[PDB]
Structures are given as structure tokens and as C-alpha cells.
Design a protein around this ligand. Sequence first.
Ligand code: BCL
Ligand code: BCL
Ligand code: BPH
Ligand code: BPH
Ligand code: CRT
Ligand code: LMT
Ligand code: FE
Ligand code: MG
Lengths: 278, 48, 47, 318, 46, 46, 46, 274, 45, 46, 46, 46, 46, 46
Amino acid sequence: MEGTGALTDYMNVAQMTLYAFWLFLAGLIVYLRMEDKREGYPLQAEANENCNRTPEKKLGFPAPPSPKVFKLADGRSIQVPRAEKTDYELNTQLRAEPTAPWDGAPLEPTGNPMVDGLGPAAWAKREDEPEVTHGGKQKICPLRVATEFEVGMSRDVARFWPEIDPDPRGYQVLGCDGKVAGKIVDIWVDRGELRPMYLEMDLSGVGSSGDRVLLPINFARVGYDSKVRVNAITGQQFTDVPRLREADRISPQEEDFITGYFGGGVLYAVPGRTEPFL
Amino acid sequence: SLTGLSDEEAKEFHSIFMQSFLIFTAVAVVAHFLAWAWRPWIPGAEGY
Amino acid sequence: LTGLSDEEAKEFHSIFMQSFLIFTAVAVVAHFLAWAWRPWIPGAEGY
Amino acid sequence: AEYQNIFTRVQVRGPTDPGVELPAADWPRTKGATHSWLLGKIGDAQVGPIYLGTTGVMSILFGIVSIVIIGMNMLASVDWSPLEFIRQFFWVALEPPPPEYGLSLPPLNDGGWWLIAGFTLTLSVLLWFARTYNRARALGLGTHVAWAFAAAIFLFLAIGFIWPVLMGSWAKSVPFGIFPHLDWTTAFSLRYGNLYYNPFHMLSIVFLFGSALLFAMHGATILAAGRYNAEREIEQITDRGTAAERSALFWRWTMGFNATMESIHRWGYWFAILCVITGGIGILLTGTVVENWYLWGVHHGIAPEYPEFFTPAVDPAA
Amino acid sequence: MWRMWKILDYRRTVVLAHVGMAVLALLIHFILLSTENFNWLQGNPY
Amino acid sequence: MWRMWKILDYRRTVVLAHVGMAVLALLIHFILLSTENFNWLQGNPY
Amino acid sequence: MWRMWKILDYRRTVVLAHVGMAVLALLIHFILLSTENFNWLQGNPY
Amino acid sequence: AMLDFEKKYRVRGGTLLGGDLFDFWIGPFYVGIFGVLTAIFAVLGTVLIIYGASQDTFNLWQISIAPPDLSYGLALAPMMEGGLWQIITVCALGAFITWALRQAEISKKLGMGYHVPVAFAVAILAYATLVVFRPLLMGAWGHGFPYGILSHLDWVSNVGYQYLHFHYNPAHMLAVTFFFTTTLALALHGGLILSVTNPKKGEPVKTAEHENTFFRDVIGYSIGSLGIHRLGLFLALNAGFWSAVCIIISGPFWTRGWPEWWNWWLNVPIWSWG
Amino acid sequence: NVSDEEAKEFHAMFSQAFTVYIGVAVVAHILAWAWRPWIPGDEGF
Amino acid sequence: MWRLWKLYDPRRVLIGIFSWLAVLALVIHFILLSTDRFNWVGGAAV
Amino acid sequence: MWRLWKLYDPRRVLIGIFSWLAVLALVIHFILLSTDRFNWVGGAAV
Amino acid sequence: MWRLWKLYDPRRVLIGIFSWLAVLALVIHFILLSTDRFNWVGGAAV
Amino acid sequence: MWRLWKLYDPRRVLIGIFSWLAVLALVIHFILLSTDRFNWVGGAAV
Amino acid sequence: MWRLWKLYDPRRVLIGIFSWLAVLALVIHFILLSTDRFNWVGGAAV
Ligand code: BCL
Ligand code: BCL
Ligand SMILES: CC[C@H]1c2cc3[nH]c4c(c3C)C(=O)[C@H](C(=O)OC)c4c3nc(cc4[nH]c(cc(n2)[C@@H]1C)c(C(C)=O)c4C)[C@@H](C)[C@@H]3CCC(=O)OC/C=C(/C)CCC[C@H](C)CCC[C@H](C)CCCC(C)C
Ligand SMILES: CC[C@H]1c2cc3[nH]c4c(c3C)C(=O)[C@H](C(=O)OC)c4c3nc(cc4[nH]c(cc(n2)[C@@H]1C)c(C(C)=O)c4C)[C@@H](C)[C@@H]3CCC(=O)OC/C=C(\C)CCC[C@H](C)CCC[C@H](C)CCCC(C)C
Ligand SMILES: COC(C)(C)C/C=C/C(C)=C/C=C/C(C)=C/C=C/C(C)=C/C=C\C=C(C)\C=C\C=C(C)\C=C\C=C(C)\C=C\CC(C)(C)OC
Ligand SMILES: CCCCCCCCCCCCO[C@@H]1O[C@H](CO)[C@@H](O[C@H]2O[C@H](CO)[C@@H](O)[C@H](O)[C@H]2O)[C@H](O)[C@H]1O
Ligand SMILES: [Fe+3]
Ligand SMILES: [Mg+2]
């Protein structure tokens, strides 16, 4: 053909602009997949996957990039993927047995999967130092120390329509089996996220009234009848929720312990959840 | 709950509200009488 | 205020006015050359 | 019966966050900040304060001038009737210059007001770019938002300024109206032979559809892993929690490959800005180096061929 | 009238005045360029 | 029949009632404005 | 009716009154411009 | 091979069907019963597509499996007259539905909510609107779109111009608004997260304080870490849903030009001015 | 959490407001009918 | 009916009424302007 | 049959019934408005 | 009337007044540019 | 050749083999339904 | 006048001035390229 844009008898400028973008899109796709390989890589090929019956490491394609250094606010240059998390995962002895020796067989937990961190109950290896705001305050703290927060975004809504702006303090907690686990005594708020994160409760229903346990808010269904319904775990199972090292702080690790325990209830709280519909 | 407002103060607001509504409607009715005197808005059988 | 003493403020101003004068003077020469080329102020009849 | 992380049930209100301290040359922020219960259900309840600096003020002034010019010309076209303005609100427009003016400056009522509105609108969006750039730098953040905005600016400039300039007439540009700029969009495709066959329009749609696909995938995944504080994504990038692992494992088990807490936002960022960049390139190619996009597709063997169903029409003026 | 600078911030009034006059100067110069009687570059008859 | 208000919340029932009755009343008034025999402003024959 | 300011916040009411009257005055003036008999800048016979 | 943290999560359970029989991983993919089904459906549909391609042309863009003639109504057609399209439709529908059920098995196993399968059910709803629901209401499977990279673009073009200006479709303007707004939100969300975790070199990784401060500095509002993902999901799902609405009302509930639909707006008694 | 006394008082405010609103609307429909009846006959209006 | 204000906050009722009255009077005045017969500034004959 | 309310919340039921009745009543009315025999405002003849 | 400046920040009131005057003056000037009689740059006769 | 099962689990190869057979049988049966000569239910002649 | 630099950062003012000059120069040069008299590369005659 002829006209403006012709490069040969067949090639034209728009077509070669397109292939130019193909080369860029590939280089971007390869670059994006490398950024994908900074967590969990290199892959751990177990012995039972390889014909030589030896554990190995697979880079995949594209191979992972070099380690990446995140300088942190408190003056700590962390490298990603983090060495301590990889070392914890590779050395932890799981309390589970594969349902079959071949690769891809699911693990069947031996003891109690909820307290052993198996499957939906699992936790990552995180820091034990409680998080801080940019200004140095305690990031996730209960309302008894984070006294500048009051429950309820709108005072008028909380006073005249408390159903849609509730205050769950003093609410009874029920498990997936309808049994009473205790009473909510406090609310934990993230000073950065400006949201409730945990509902601290006592175990007055299934244990000691003086015991304190954190219930993650995303596992709590704060009702309209002064009852909080947790579908994750049975009411009797609130006693084994991991306790805080310090009654007034939570490390990111304990957040993974506590949310992990409730997440494990989705499969292990009662018999039959693991079992299919049919 | 309830609006924080005295039982007598609630009677006071209502009295002014009903006097203001009555004055508002009293002006509206006169305005309507003036408009109907201009051009009536309820047509007859054959229209206007 | 910004981190300038009365001396550093004056030192900046002297160089600033010198740069501004030179930039303007070059521009003025460019405008005299352009007017010599084609004036941009038409008469009542136009161009 | 499980909580679906769709609305925030329990909210907690504290003092208004005045924002992170700025350097000691920035303008003071506004003093106005209030909390909204309705907005607090979806997310952060605080409304305001807002910063306004040199770039922000000048962007607002240039933009207000543009909106006043468009609005007053729109209102003038309906003989200044506010009622007729509402009746014709989607149909009125500030019309671009007619083709006879080329790239020259046309009279105010013959596209001159359009050219001034386009110039001030271009200045306001460019200053707003500098504002987004500087607000990130003032907080010590990367300039990713500004460059993503710059990518959207480039399509805006390609459509309205660069392509009409490459074509040699302001008539080719898009009028400031709701239905009229939809008329421009359709007529553009009619004129240059079905923009569907433009490959960079195809790629533009790939990244646009992939952007909605990605936000739906990512937003659903963060809500699904909200039980493990997935939405605190900055903590998960610097300290991989179980939520980051369950999000990655979910997609690794589904489609065989995953991302990280950080790399997902690189995928979404590039999909958003590639949509608008291939869009700009596709617009710049048509009219300039491709006359008819269906004929271009026929040449490169991409046009489907259709068997006989009707008697083909013949041009009487052939 | 220096008491005006005990109400308004002279630092941000100066910035605002300069950017405000910039918008108006471009607007007026461009309006004049879009008229037949005052586009000094087109030079139409007066 | 006062027991209706031990069932619903009376405060929100009244607010909902006003908004619903406003929407319905504008619905009916506009519908009559679109008919020919009941458009009292148009004043067509009956 | 000085008690009205123990109900309505006077600072916000004053501002919203000026904003609201700005829209209404502009709207009424614009409506008169659109009519033939009351556009003072057009000067049609009355 | 597995991610270095992946092993502890690979447990038994979470299936809806199949139980232990299909509850395993092949490489990185979890299989499940709906993975076997989605594999059979996907391979069947893809191989049937290639067979249809072998009968007209192998050019990738020009491959087209077209729906049957409208004269066929809802009857199943001969294979080379749109019956091949109909089988591919039931294969693709099954492939999509078992994909979402499989993502539901993966959701339960990792203790996640069902947001992903449900958000995908909206995408499946839009395809079902395109090939099942709208062809049903109009009365023929031939109203669905052909399965071809460039032949389905002509379908979109012609179906859009069946209403003479498809930009005036009120539900389409809403869906386009949701599509444009969600990629705008995706640009802001992706950019802001990268801007915090990747600040200027020599700066610490910032906080959620800086994220809220940035958008309060720019637009005067910040939706927060949690709000951006609710809104992001909301905008994209409304984009899919209003796509379904805009196409389901084009022909079953509107047969005229879409610009004419706005005649009610032009006739509102408030602002007729005549 | 609404008592019998609160419920009775609410229904008195409801009764008084329902009575006026119905009584006026019935008068509105009588005037509307006296103007142009809205139920057509076999031949129309 | 004095108890109506022990339930409903006077400010919100008055703001709601004022918003309804403003919208309603604007809508009625606009509807009249849209008709040929009651457009008082359009100056038509009956 | 009173045991029905032991299993179902009266507010939820009455809200659901009224939303069903309101929508069903609206739809039947609008279906009758679109016919040629039961369009009462349109004044159609048999 | 002087107590207004205790109710509001005078800086805010001035900024709001000026911002309003600037838009109002521009709207008025644009209006006069629209009409034949008062378009001064167009220079049309009477 | 028995040692192939020291490498692949009998459950997985059988699931994959049977899935392959199901796909294959349907593709071949459907391809025959596409052809005019082997569409047995269509029943063309030779 | 030198007291300007205590009020403002020299880097910010220089970046602002230079960005204004670059855009002003770009705008003026483009405006001249669009006319038929001062388009120098076009070589149009007077
Ligand atoms: C001239 C033609 C008309 C027009 C006619 C039409 C017609 C006809 C339609 C649209 C539709 C759309 N139009 Mg339109 N449209 C026009 C111009 C535009 C313009 C523009 C630039 O002006 C824009 C931005 C849009 C935007 C849109 C969207 C709102 C919508 C498409 C998104 C969608 O449906 O998602 C939905 C996403 C899907 C349906 C994808 C389904 C995903 C399934 C579930 C999974 C598939 C998996 C896949 C097989 C996996 C592959 C294998 C692996 C990769 C290995 N249109 C012009 C004016 N438009 C469509 C719509 O709304 O339908 C719902 C539609 O039918
Ligand atoms: C000074 C005192 C207050 C006042 C104090 C009270 C008190 C106290 C009460 C009322 C109540 C009412 N008031 Mg009042 N009211 C005032 C002055 C007025 C004026 C006026 C012009 O002055 C009007 C018209 C009204 C009107 C009303 C009615 C809404 C209601 C009485 C009828 C009823 O029983 O509703 C009952 C009808 C329903 C509950 C039906 C619900 C409406 C539903 C939602 C509509 C569904 C259909 C609709 C078509 C859906 C639209 C969908 C479309 C497809 C778009 N009030 C003044 C301002 N008023 C009563 C009330 O609210 O009852 C609950 C009541 O108790
Ligand atoms: C509704 C909001 C947006 C959205 C959401 C969304 N999509 C999703 C999801 C979500 C939440 C997933 O979880 C799921 C996923 O896991 O993605 C990685 C998915 C997905 N969306 C996909 C694609 C996709 N989404 C699209 C759109 C959208 N997805 C919306 C804009 C489009 C468009 C607009 O065209 C495409 C192409 C896949 C990547 C994936 C679903 C994968 C799947 O279902 O796999 C099943 C097995 C297969 C191999 C599919 C093919 C099997 C068939 C028998 C053959 C092909 C038939 C088909 C009719 C051919 C048509 C071709 C012609 C049109 C050219
Ligand atoms: C990746 C490409 C996508 C994208 C990205 C994108 N857009 C962006 C950004 C990014 C990354 C920004 O950072 C920027 C932004 O601010 O985001 C919130 C923006 C933005 N994208 C916007 C719009 C937008 N983006 C679009 C599209 C897209 N944006 C792409 C799909 C579109 C479409 C689909 O057409 C639109 C319409 C803006 C909301 C914003 C940039 C705003 C801007 O430039 O404004 C300039 C200034 C004005 C217009 C001045 C007038 C404004 C007010 C009227 C002034 C008020 C005056 C006074 C303060 C008050 C007066 C009233 C009194 C009574 C108080
Ligand atoms: C009367 O109204 C008042 C005052 C009350 C306020 C109301 C205002 C209203 C209601 C305004 C309504 C506005 C609307 C609805 C606008 C709709 C706008 C739309 C849909 C626009 C869509 C697309 C428009 C585009 C893409 C425009 C592109 C134009 C461009 C990019 C122009 C570029 C021009 C440049 C850079 C100018 C260069 C000038 C130079 C100097 C180069 O010339 C020599
Ligand atoms: C678990 C899922 C179960 C499957 C669900 C199937 C739902 C979708 C099908 C709904 C019913 C469709 O009903 C379909 O109507 C068409 C009418 O055009 C019938 O078609 C019939 O009449 C047409 C003419 O009208 C004849 O040419 C044709 O030979 C004859 O079969 C189909 O025989 C029937 O299948
Ligand atoms: Fe995110
Ligand atoms: Mg047009």
C-alpha cells in the first residue's frame, strides 16, 4: 500500500509501533513476574517430588530478583525475602502427616490443627515488637489506653439509632454452636487505621471471668440484640485462643496467632466442615 | 433514645412551630387567592 | 522563615537581579530583531 | 452466616488527624475536618482537611476559569434559560472551532472560547499534576500517583491537543459536552473506519478490562483475607503475615501463579496506566499513519470474512 | 494599609496575587487574540 | 392497635412514611400531569 | 424569634443563606434574561 | 514445588464435592473435583474451537465459531451451523461455573471468605447475559456473540449500532463510568502503595498515616486501607453488573434508538419551558 | 425496649396525624371527583 | 403533639422541612414557567 | 399457628410483607395502566 | 454588626468575598460579551 | 514397565487418563456429527 | 525587596519562575507558528 506511514510494500508505521509495544509489554511482563517472586522463593522442591529423592530449589521462570532492602522508619534496613521467616518455615516440624507420600497430597493434621497452626489455622513468623505509629504511639492498643477514641463515629446516630452505630462493650459472645463464651470488656483500635481491630472479651461463660482473650473483628458479627456471634469457632474453643504476652499490647506475631486460630475454626471448629457437601 | 429537651421546652417549640406554620400557610393562602384572581388553574369541561 | 540570613538573602538577590536583567536584556534584543523582521502592531488598515 | 467485610460494623472516632507534618515552607493546611458516619461505614470517616499550595491554587483558578467559560457558553446556547439548561444539560456543549480555521486562533464564538477553555483546562490538569507530585514528595513518598496521573494526562492531551495538532485543525478535537463528546467518540470511529480494528485500541481495552479484572480480583482477595488484616497492606509488605501468604496461595492454587502484597500493586498500577498509554498511541496513529482501520485490518489479515447471507449492495455511484 | 498584613498572610497573598494575575493575563490576552479587532497577530482592519 | 410501636421503631417509621408518601404523591401528581384528561395546567377538554 | 438561634447554628445558617441566595439571585436574573420581555440587555419591546 | 511457606497450608478439606478423591495439587494448581471438571470443559471447548477453526481458517484473529441463525430460535442447530457454538457455550459456562466453585474450595481451605468466587460470579453473570439470558428474552440462541477474536468485535459494533447510538444507553453510561472510575481507583491504589513502600531512595518505608495524609492533601478525602478495597471491588462489580443491565435492556426492553430514551428527560414538566 | 405507656403515646400522635391526613385526602378526592371523575364509562370520559 | 419534639430533633425537622419547601417551591415555580398558561414572564395570552 | 411467630421475627415479617405488598400493588396498578381495558386515567373506551 | 468578625475569621470572610467577586465579575463580563449591545470588543453599532 | 507406578500415583494417572478419554470421545463423536458422511443421526446418504 | 528570600525558598521560586517561562515561551512560539504572518518556518510572505 501507499500513503503516509508506509515502511515497505507491507509494513507500516502503526504495525511496527505495535510490535515495538509487544517488546515492551514482554519486558514489563517479565519484570512484573520477577516482582512476584520476592515472597516464598526460591521454591522448595521436596524429596518426594523429584526422581532423585532429594530436596531441591526451583527458581522458576523468570528467576527471582536479587534481595530487596526496605529501610524502615525506626532505622532498620530489612531485606526481602526475610531470612528469619524462611528459616522458620523450612525448619518448623509440622504436626501433620501427608495423606499420601506422592507430591501434591494434602496434609492431615495429627494433633489439634487449630493450636498447631495447620492450614487455615496457620501463622506466619512475624516480629514480636508491637507496632508504632509514625509519631511513636502504640499502634494497636485497647480503648482503655487509647483514651482519645470513643466508640461510635456519630454521637447522634449512636444515641438515637444505636443499631447502626453500635457499642459492643458488654456484649455477650456466642460461638458457632450458639453457646455463650463470655462478655466483651474492651475494644482494640489501630491508631493508624482508625478502626476497631479486636474485641477483648472475658471467659465468664466457659472459663475464668478474669481471663482475657482477643476476638478479631472480622470474625465477629456484632448483632442488633447485644450479642456478638462468632461463626469461626465453638464457644468452648474460646478458651484456647492464644493469650497476649502483655495485657495491653499485641505484637504482629500475636495478631497472626490470634487471627490464625479463629481462621482455623473454618475447617476444624466442628466435625463435618472439612467434609464436602456430598 | 429521646431528644435531650425539657418537657416544657418541647411544648414551647411546638407553640412557635404551629404559629410559624400557621403564618406560613396564611401567607400561602393569600398568595393563592391572588393567583386564582390572575389565572384560575382548575379548567372547566371545555378547557380554558 | 526559610533558612537564609539577611546576607545570604542579599547575595541571592544580587545574583537574581543580575540574572533577571541579563535574561530580560537578551529578550529585549530578540524583540528588536523580531520587530526589524516583521512588526506586530498593525495600523487601522491592517498589514 | 459470616461477616462479609462489606460495611464497617463498629466504628471508633478520635480526634481529627491533622496529617503528617509538612516541611517548614509548605502552606498551612485547612482547619476544616469533620467525621462522617456514612463514609465511615465504607472506610475512613474523616473528611478533610485539604492542602492548597501554589500549584493547587493556580490549578483551581485555571480550572474554574475553564468551567466558567464552558458553563457560560453552554448557558448562552440555550438563551440563558436555567430551565432549558437542565432540559438540555447532557446535550449542550462548548463547540470546537470549525475546520476552516486549521490550527489558527479562531474568533471567540467560533471555537475561540473552546480554545481558551481547552488551554486553561490543560493548565489546571498540568498544575494538578505538579500538586500530586509535590504532595507525595512533601511526605517523602514516591511519585507513582503523579506519573500514573501523567499517563492519564497524556491521553487527554493526545485526544484534545496533540492529535488535532498533528491533523492540522482544532475541529478534530472534542467538544466540552456530555452527549457531544460521546458524539465525538462515535464519529471518530466512523470517520477512521471502526476503531475496534485499531490494535492499540484493542490493547487499551485489554488493560482497561484487565484493570477492572485486577481490582475485582485484588479487592475481593483483600476483603476475603480481611480476617487476617490483609487490608493493612503496608505491614504485610514489610512483614509478611499470614494474610499475604493466604492471598498468594489462593491465586497460586487457582491459576498456578501468584503475586506478592507489593507486586499486585505493580500489576494494577501498570494495567491502569498502560490502558491510558496505548489509548494515546492508538489515537495518535489514526488519521496520521492509518486512514481506515478496517482496511488496515484487511491488509494485515485480521478482518473476519463472512459467507453470503444477503445480496451485496452495489454503490450506484461507482 | 499595613494592618492588612496582620489579617492576611503577606507570604501567601503575594503567591496568590502572582498566580491569580497570571491566570487573568493569559485569559485576557487570549480573548483579545480571539477577536477580529484586537488580534494584533492577525492584523485585521480596524 | 398501639402495640404496632412495640414492634417497629416509631421514630423511623414516621420518617420513612413521610419520604415514601412524598415520593408516591409526586409520582401520582406527575402521572396526572402526563395524562390528557387530568392535566389541570394544560386544561384540555374532558 | 431570637430563640431560632438556640436551634439553628447561626454561623452555619448565615453562610448557607448567602450561598443559597447567590444561587437563587443568579437563577432569577438568568430566567429574566431568557425571557423576551425582561431581558434588559437585549431591549425587546414590552 | 511449593513456596517456602506453602507447605503448612496444604491441608485436607474445604471441598464441596469429590471429598478426598480429587483433593490434591498438581504442581502449583489445586485440583479438586471442579478443577477436573473445569479441565474437561476447557479442553473440550478449546479443542472444539480449533475444529471449527480448521473448517474455515487457522488465522488466529479470523477464527470464528458463530451462533446459529435466528431462524433456528431456541432449537439446537446442526454442528456446522451454530451447533458447534452452542456446545462451546455450555462448555464455557460449565468451565466458568466450575472455576468459581473450585475457587470456593480454595477459599475454604485457606480460611478466606468467598469474595473471589462471588466477584467472579458477576463476570459469569455478564457472559450469561450475553449468551443465555438476552438470547432467551429475544427468542433465539443466535443473538449471542460469536467466539472469535475479531468476529466478536463486529458483533459488539453491530449490536451497538442496532440502537443507532449506544453511548446514550443510560445503563451503558453508568457501566462505562464504573469502568473508568475503577481503573482510576486502581491507578491511585497501586500508585499509593508503591509510593509508600518505595519512597524516594534514602527514605524509610512510610505508614498508613502518610497514605491518609496524601489523599487528604490532594483531594481532601481519604477512603483508607480497608475502604479502597471495598470501593475497588464495588466499582468493578458494578462495572460488570451494569454491563449486564445495559445489554439485557438493549433489545428485550428497548428496541428504539438509545438517544430517544432520553425523551422522558426532555419532557419533564419542571423544565419544559414550552 | 418500648414500654406500654410510650407505645400508647406514639399511637396517639399517629392517630391524630393519620386522622387529619386521611380526612383531608378524602376531601381532596371529593373535590377531584366533582371536577373530573377518573373512572371512565363504556364510551370513555 | 407537643411530644413530637421530644422524639424528633427540632433542628433536623426544620432543616428537613426547609429543604422540602425550597425544593418544592422551586419545582412548582419551574413547572409554572414550563406551561404556556402560567408562565408569568413569558407573557402569553389565554 | 401462633407458633409461626416463635420462629420468625415480627418486625422482619411485617417489613417483608409490606415491601411485597407495596411492590406487588405498584406492579399490578402499572400493568393495568398499560392495558387498553383497565387504563382508568387514559379513559379508554371498551 | 461588628460582632460578625468575632463569629468568623476575617481572613476566611475576605477570601470568600473576593473569590465570589472574581467569579461574579467574570460572569457579568461574559454576559455582556454575549449580547450585541454591550459587546465592547466586538464593537457592533447600536 | 511396572515401575511407572513407583513414579505416578494410580489415583492421579487414572483421573488424568479418564479425563483424557472423556474429552477425546466427545471430540471425536462431535467431529463426526459435524461431518455430512458420519452424522449418523443426521442420516445423510453416500 | 531582598526580604523576599527570607519569605520564600529560592529553589521553589526558581523552579516556579522557570516553569512559567518555559510554558510561556512554548505558548508564544506556538501562537506565532499558527499565524500566517509570524510563522517563520512556513515562509509565508507579508
Ligand atoms: C459501537 C458499539 C457501542 C458499544 C456497544 C456495546 C455492546 C453490544 C456491548 C458493550 C459492552 C460494554 N461496553 Mg460498549 N459500546 C461502545 C463503546 C464503548 C466505550 C467507548 C470507548 O466509547 C466504552 C468504554 C464501552 C464500555 C463497555 C463496557 C461497559 C461493556 C463491556 C465490559 C463488560 O461487559 O464486562 C463483562 C466481562 C465479561 C462478560 C467477560 C466474561 C468473563 C468470563 C466469565 C470468563 C472468561 C475467561 C476466559 C475464557 C479465560 C481465557 C482462557 C485463559 C486466559 C487461558 N463501550 C459503542 C458506542 N458495548 C458489553 C456489555 O456491557 O455486556 C455485558 C456489550 O455486550
Ligand atoms: C407538626 C407535626 C408534623 C407532622 C407530625 C406527624 C406525626 C406524629 C405523624 C405524622 C404522620 C404523617 N404525616 Mg406528618 N406532620 C406534619 C405535617 C404533615 C403534612 C403537611 C403538608 O403539613 C403532610 C402531607 C404530612 C404527612 C404525613 C404522612 C406521611 C403521615 C400520615 C399518613 C400516614 O398514616 O402514613 C402511613 C403510611 C405509610 C406508613 C405507608 C408508607 C409509605 C411507603 C414507604 C410508600 C410505598 C409506596 C411508594 C409508591 C413507593 C415508591 C417507589 C416508587 C416505585 C418510586 N404531615 C408536621 C410537620 N406526622 C404519621 C406517620 O408517619 O405514620 C407512620 C404520624 O404518626
Ligand atoms: C466483573 C468484573 C471483571 C472481572 C472479574 C473477575 N474475573 C475473574 C475473576 C474475577 C473476580 C476471577 O476470580 C477469575 C480468575 O481467577 O481470574 C484470574 C476471573 C477470570 N476472568 C478471566 C478473563 C476475563 N475477565 C473479563 C472481565 C471481567 N472479569 C470484568 C471486567 C474478560 C473480558 C472483559 O473479556 C476476560 C477475558 C480469566 C482470566 C479468569 C477466569 C478463568 C476461567 O474461567 O477459566 C475456565 C477455564 C478456561 C481455560 C476458560 C476457557 C474454556 C472455554 C470452554 C473456551 C473458551 C470459550 C469462550 C467463550 C471463548 C471466547 C473467545 C472470544 C471472545 C474471542
Ligand atoms: C490510569 C489512567 C486513569 C486515571 C488516573 C488518574 N486520574 C487522576 C489521578 C490518576 C492517577 C490523580 O492523581 C488525579 C487525582 O486527583 O486523583 C484523585 C486524577 C484525576 N482524574 C480526574 C478525572 C478523571 N480521570 C479520568 C480517567 C483516568 N484517570 C484514567 C482511566 C477521567 C475520565 C474517565 O474521563 C476523569 C474525568 C480528576 C478528578 C483528578 C484530577 C483533577 C484535576 O486535574 O483538577 C484540575 C482542577 C480543576 C478542574 C479546577 C476545578 C475544580 C473545582 C470546581 C474547584 C473548586 C474551587 C473551590 C476550592 C471551592 C468552590 C466552592 C465554594 C462554595 C466552597
Ligand atoms: C454558567 O455556569 C456556571 C458559571 C454557573 C458554572 C457551571 C458550569 C458547568 C455546568 C459546566 C459544565 C461543564 C461540562 C458538563 C463539561 C463537559 C466536559 C466534557 C465531557 C469534556 C470531555 C472531553 C473534552 C476534552 C477531552 C477536551 C480536550 C481539550 C484539550 C485537551 C485542549 C487542549 C488545548 C490546549 C492545550 C490549548 C492550547 C492553546 C495554544 C496556546 C496552544 O494555542 C495557541
Ligand atoms: C441442568 C441444565 C438442564 C438444561 C436446561 C436447558 C435450559 C435452556 C433450554 C430452555 C428450553 C428451550 O426450548 C427450545 O425451544 C426451541 C424452539 O425454538 C425448540 O425447537 C423446536 O422448535 C423449533 C422451531 O421453533 C424446531 O426447528 C426444532 O426442530 C424443535 O426442536 C427446542 O427443541 C427447545 O430446546
Ligand atoms: Fe491493595
Ligand atoms: Mg459534536
